[PDB]
Subunit: 99 residues, 3 copies
């Protein structure tokens, strides 16, 4: 009855710190890779998360809050500029073990 | 309401440059990792692609062309024909896919 | 064809022996270096495309190579310290190609 799923969240380096700390204080075993992506093929991070099915939406909301797309004020006259964004996918898991 | 899959493509560092560019000019959101593999446990690169089911075959063809196994002529630091490239790829189902 | 993918997350200290194990065992693993755990420290992840029939074989290779245990460590009176431990999940795959 151990219905397990894997969530893969791709996320911006900026938000990756706060998120990973969130996961911990939220009792979520995440493992973090660093990747590239985007038009400019810049750096970002990817998370992989073995989690029980029942808890997924908990996890997704954790992410949304941490890394949703927003705009902020930035100076090179400050300007509103867009930051953040997360793409995430949750895969099924046939079997899950800890050794 | 659009069934998406995830393709994972493992590929030669040599061809990863061209491919990744291809993905972009062809509107494929791939994310690229730096890995090791093979008998020598040397460096290659892995790709991860969240894409709609209907589009998978397209993506595979993009890969095959960009990274299939071939032979090339190479002089050793008189020339000889050696094998290069090669790509392994898996496509797996995804239950749910969100952008935030 | 009946391919499955195993992701195995495993401690840096065990990863060398494991990766050699895979090779000598005709298992094609690809290896990422990642971080995880409470302290957010380096470990390593493996991804392994494999015929369904061989999964338990692979799993055993892993359990043996990376299971959790205690060893004798000296702080820089030897002491028993716990080490290793792996966590692994095997997922289905719809389609597998080599090019």
């Amino acid at each position: 009855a151990m219905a397990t799923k894997l969530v893969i969240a791709i996320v911006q380096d900026k938000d990756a710190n706060y998120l990973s700390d969130q996961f911990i204080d939220q009792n979520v075993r995440a493992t973090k890779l660093s990747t590239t992506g985007g038009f400019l093929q810049s750096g970002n991070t990817t998370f992989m998360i073995g989690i029980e099915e029942e808890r997924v939406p908990e996890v997704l909301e954790i992410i949304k809050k941490a890394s949703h797309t927003r705009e902020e004020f930035m100076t090179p006259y400050p300007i509103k500029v867009q930051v953040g964004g997360a793409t995430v996918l949750v895969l099924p898991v046939d079997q899950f073990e800890r050794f």
